[PDB]
Design an enzyme around this catalytic site. Structure first.
Site, PDB file in Angstrom:
ATOM      1  N   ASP A  39       0.823  -1.207   0.000  1.00  0.00           N
ATOM      2  CA  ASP A  39       0.000   0.000   0.000  1.00  0.00           C
ATOM      3  C   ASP A  39       0.854   1.252   0.000  1.00  0.00           C
ATOM      4  O   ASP A  39       1.505   1.569   1.004  1.00  0.00           O
ATOM      5  CB  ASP A  39      -0.914   0.015   1.237  1.00  0.00           C
ATOM      6  CG  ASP A  39      -1.840   1.242   1.286  1.00  0.00           C
ATOM      7  OD1 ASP A  39      -1.729   2.132   0.410  1.00  0.00           O
ATOM      8  OD2 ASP A  39      -2.717   1.402   2.180  1.00  0.00           O
ATOM      9  N   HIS A  64      -1.143   6.397  -8.174  1.00  0.00           N
ATOM     10  CA  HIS A  64      -2.438   7.057  -8.138  1.00  0.00           C
ATOM     11  C   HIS A  64      -2.584   7.453  -9.603  1.00  0.00           C
ATOM     12  O   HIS A  64      -1.768   8.227 -10.123  1.00  0.00           O
ATOM     13  CB  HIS A  64      -2.393   8.264  -7.200  1.00  0.00           C
ATOM     14  CG  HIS A  64      -3.634   9.109  -7.183  1.00  0.00           C
ATOM     15  ND1 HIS A  64      -4.230   9.600  -8.326  1.00  0.00           N
ATOM     16  CD2 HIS A  64      -4.345   9.612  -6.143  1.00  0.00           C
ATOM     17  CE1 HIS A  64      -5.271  10.347  -7.987  1.00  0.00           C
ATOM     18  NE2 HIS A  64      -5.363  10.366  -6.670  1.00  0.00           N
ATOM     19  N   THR A  65      -3.577   6.891 -10.285  1.00  0.00           N
ATOM     20  CA  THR A  65      -3.714   7.116 -11.720  1.00  0.00           C
ATOM     21  C   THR A  65      -4.996   7.804 -12.149  1.00  0.00           C
ATOM     22  O   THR A  65      -5.218   8.021 -13.342  1.00  0.00           O
ATOM     23  CB  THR A  65      -3.632   5.795 -12.426  1.00  0.00           C
ATOM     24  OG1 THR A  65      -4.728   4.979 -11.983  1.00  0.00           O
ATOM     25  CG2 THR A  65      -2.366   5.038 -12.004  1.00  0.00           C
ATOM     26  N   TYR A 102       7.250   3.698 -13.724  1.00  0.00           N
ATOM     27  CA  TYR A 102       6.453   4.172 -14.852  1.00  0.00           C
ATOM     28  C   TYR A 102       6.018   5.608 -14.593  1.00  0.00           C
ATOM     29  O   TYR A 102       5.620   5.962 -13.481  1.00  0.00           O
ATOM     30  CB  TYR A 102       5.262   3.228 -15.124  1.00  0.00           C
ATOM     31  CG  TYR A 102       5.746   1.828 -15.480  1.00  0.00           C
ATOM     32  CD1 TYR A 102       5.858   0.861 -14.504  1.00  0.00           C
ATOM     33  CD2 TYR A 102       6.120   1.495 -16.782  1.00  0.00           C
ATOM     34  CE1 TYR A 102       6.311  -0.380 -14.768  1.00  0.00           C
ATOM     35  CE2 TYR A 102       6.605   0.225 -17.077  1.00  0.00           C
ATOM     36  CZ  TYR A 102       6.696  -0.708 -16.046  1.00  0.00           C
ATOM     37  OH  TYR A 102       7.167  -1.958 -16.235  1.00  0.00           O
ATOM     38  N   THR A 104       4.787   9.542 -16.950  1.00  0.00           N
ATOM     39  CA  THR A 104       3.791  10.002 -17.905  1.00  0.00           C
ATOM     40  C   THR A 104       4.157  11.169 -18.789  1.00  0.00           C
ATOM     41  O   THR A 104       4.993  11.987 -18.434  1.00  0.00           O
ATOM     42  CB  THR A 104       2.550  10.347 -17.108  1.00  0.00           C
ATOM     43  OG1 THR A 104       1.590  10.946 -17.972  1.00  0.00           O
ATOM     44  CG2 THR A 104       2.825  11.426 -16.098  1.00  0.00           C
ATOM     45  N   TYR A 128      -1.533  15.347 -11.306  1.00  0.00           N
ATOM     46  CA  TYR A 128      -1.045  14.007 -11.606  1.00  0.00           C
ATOM     47  C   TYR A 128       0.319  14.091 -12.277  1.00  0.00           C
ATOM     48  O   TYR A 128       1.244  13.392 -11.897  1.00  0.00           O
ATOM     49  CB  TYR A 128      -2.032  13.271 -12.507  1.00  0.00           C
ATOM     50  CG  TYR A 128      -1.500  11.978 -13.117  1.00  0.00           C
ATOM     51  CD1 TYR A 128      -1.252  10.859 -12.336  1.00  0.00           C
ATOM     52  CD2 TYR A 128      -1.265  11.880 -14.476  1.00  0.00           C
ATOM     53  CE1 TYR A 128      -0.784   9.668 -12.902  1.00  0.00           C
ATOM     54  CE2 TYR A 128      -0.794  10.711 -15.045  1.00  0.00           C
ATOM     55  CZ  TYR A 128      -0.568   9.596 -14.258  1.00  0.00           C
ATOM     56  OH  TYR A 128      -0.085   8.411 -14.843  1.00  0.00           O
ATOM     57  N   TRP A 153      -1.465   6.978 -22.683  1.00  0.00           N
ATOM     58  CA  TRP A 153      -2.634   6.366 -23.266  1.00  0.00           C
ATOM     59  C   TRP A 153      -2.600   4.842 -23.129  1.00  0.00           C
ATOM     60  O   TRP A 153      -2.799   4.115 -24.102  1.00  0.00           O
ATOM     61  CB  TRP A 153      -2.767   6.768 -24.721  1.00  0.00           C
ATOM     62  CG  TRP A 153      -3.000   8.235 -24.953  1.00  0.00           C
ATOM     63  CD1 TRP A 153      -2.755   9.272 -24.100  1.00  0.00           C
ATOM     64  CD2 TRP A 153      -3.504   8.818 -26.152  1.00  0.00           C
ATOM     65  NE1 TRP A 153      -3.105  10.461 -24.693  1.00  0.00           N
ATOM     66  CE2 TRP A 153      -3.586  10.201 -25.949  1.00  0.00           C
ATOM     67  CE3 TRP A 153      -3.954   8.294 -27.358  1.00  0.00           C
ATOM     68  CZ2 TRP A 153      -4.048  11.067 -26.923  1.00  0.00           C
ATOM     69  CZ3 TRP A 153      -4.414   9.149 -28.324  1.00  0.00           C
ATOM     70  CH2 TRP A 153      -4.462  10.519 -28.105  1.00  0.00           C
TER      71      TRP A 153
END
Ligand SMILES: [Mg+2]
Lengths: 298, 298
Positions: A39, A64-65, A102, A104, A128, A153
């Site tokens: 978590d 958190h996406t 990962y 963005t 984000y 995407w």
């Protein structure tokens, strides 16, 4: 080698459970892991789990996406995209572990035509994108053995995706409204997970490859052309669509709280030459996931 | 690198379309390929296709795989498992291409307890096992740059599989009869396809790894214990089963034309040390494919 994967039940995580399995001994966690903590609200928790197992490689597919949700809860987004990432980085850098992470394209602003490179400046347009930037800087500053893959995407055939959500609309609705001014390349969790597996094995033998990479399927499209391909494919598979008129629209006309970029395009030459890998055109991945979705029996 | 994949729509082929995609430029064929020949009944056809494209790597996932059917049509089985393999080997060895080829434990006889190694003698009990042996010898004798992966009890979540067929029976029938004396490790097409992708990239940098490998998921089980796991899992997912009594049975009591071995177990130490890869316990793969099957929405 031992590998520790957080976020196992997410889109990318579920495919990583598969792709990482022959790479080394896999311990796959998520929030509901009982016998271990996965978590990201407990940065010291995830930090600790990392000390308990001593992995050679940590793959973080947890995050958190929920972009829009993040604006309203930027503290929770910060904790998940930045704090816990720093925590796991510091803990990783203790045993000299690799950390795969990962990120963005939301890290960048918006300037149509031009695909962003890793050597481009960053100004996140939303929380984000902002908290993710903070996470990659925190990883960059706490752990030299890192691989950051900025993607965009993202879809998978397990669970909800753009195609599905749009197909649900095309079954039940007559006319549809979809954006034709945001540009990018839909990238499959299959592609992300497999590239990750190869990249790890390069990295262990050539640590020089550490760093920041743009990682997306090739080509470029918009949500509208993406949807027209989904509908086209669904028509060819014998799925009947109530839909008879497909209309393009500007971004603005319909609310999204958090600013989404018009230019999500990413140049991935860096990743291609350093791992000696191919990044196939975006359609291939989407068509394949559509065939899997349409070829369900029981 | 260019890669040529035959048998793209088979169980292993469908996963190879995915796993091979970032490894190099993929051309995926099958029998119905119109713009190229992928029909193994035309050995000179497949040979020719190989000359037309000049691949750096040929992955053959095409084969005559209907074991029982083979006994009645050993000419067609020979053409698919041996002749065309020789044809493609000779053609591959022209440009110095690698050839990856899948084979079988049916190459061996039957002696419970002991897992077969690559240094074991071979005496095929049936036509399928016999024609496959002829294919691996033909590959071995015509092409030094080869990787032969002998596998067994192959399943995938796309299309028909043991689990599915058994689940159909457990939905509609009350009591079931299943073998408890044939031993092996069910091996997922996911595992085969991913190991193949890693093995190719090792091979291109260390040609010394060329040769014959046993390649199966770890552990060992029987069709009965396999089925009990499938039923167990289906019960935990909320699938109600008419089935209330599960009975074990000897092989003989029910006809199979072609002799199937009682001992399909394979030692895979050779593959593990030469590619530095892990071969996870068989259950993991099966449970994952069951979850994917049970978590279908539309
Ligand atoms: Mg899959």
């Amino acid at each position: 080698m031992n590998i520790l994967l957080f976020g196992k039940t997410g889109q990318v995580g579920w495919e990583l459970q598969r792709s990482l399995a022959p790479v080394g001994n896999l311990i796959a966690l998520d929030v509901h892991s009982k016998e271990f903590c996965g978590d990201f609200s407990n940065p010291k928790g995830v930090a600790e789990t990392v000390r308990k197992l001593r992995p050679d490689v940590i793959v973080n597919a947890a995050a958190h996406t929920a972009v829009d949700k993040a604006e309203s809860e930027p503290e929770l987004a910060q904790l998940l995209n930045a704090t816990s990432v720093e925590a796991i980085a510091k803990a990783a850098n203790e045993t000299g572990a690799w950390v795969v992470h990962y990120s963005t394209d939301y890290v960048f602003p918006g300037t149509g035509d031009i695909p962003w490179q890793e050597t481009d400046a960053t100004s996140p347009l939303n929380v984000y994108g902002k908290t993710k930037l903070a996470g990659e800087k925190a990883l960059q500053d706490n752990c030299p053995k890192h691989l950051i893959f900025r993607t965009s995407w993202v879809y998978a055939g397990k669970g909800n995706n753009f195609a599905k959500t749009m197909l649900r609309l095309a079954k039940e609705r007559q006319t549809l409204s979809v954006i034709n001014d945001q540009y990018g390349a839909p990238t499959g969790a299959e592609l992300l997970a497999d590239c990750t597996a190869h990249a790890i094995r390069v990295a262990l033998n050539k640590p020089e490859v550490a760093g920041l990479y743009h990682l997306v399927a090739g080509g470029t499209t918009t949500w509208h052309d993406y949807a027209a391909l989904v509908f086209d494919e669904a028509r060819k598979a014998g799925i009947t669509l109530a839909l008879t008129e497909l209309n393009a629209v500007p971004t603005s006309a319909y609310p999204t709280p958090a600013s989404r970029p018009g230019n999500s395009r990413l140049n991935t030459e860096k990743f291609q030459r350093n791992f000696d890998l191919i990044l196939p055109q975006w359609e291939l991945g989407v068509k394949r996931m559509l065939t899997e979705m349409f070829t369900t029996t029981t």
